[PDB]
Design an enzyme around this catalytic site. Sequence first.
Site: not given
Length: 135
Positions: A16, A39-43, A130
């Site tokens: 992140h 990974k489907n999505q990540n910021t 996290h």
Amino acid sequence: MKPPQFTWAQWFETQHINMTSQQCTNAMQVINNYQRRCKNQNTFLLTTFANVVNVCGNPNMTCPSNKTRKNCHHSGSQVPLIHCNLTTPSPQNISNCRYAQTPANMFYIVACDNRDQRRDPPQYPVVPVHLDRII
């Protein structure tokens, strides 16, 4: 999940904070190659690690994702960010996965804990572990 060589703080930073490229497809290769899947999505938060560590110093609040955790902290102010969304799955050969990128300025909520006693530098006793949510 995270590879064994990373502490939670280091993994948080890898996923992140350190966007190795302003392009999601390229940036996500790092995360996907470490996790062994796309990974489907990540910021990616466009802020510094020191800034996130200071956010850990803001008042504790319940984590939006886990009603039972009280180790979350609100960023206070908004930050530029890039959200990556998987558009091309590429089952095998995860290096062929492609992503879309969505720029935005939002608040974020991070969960923080005490540093990994053996592997995290003593410089930061408290570290983000996290990303619970972006608003």
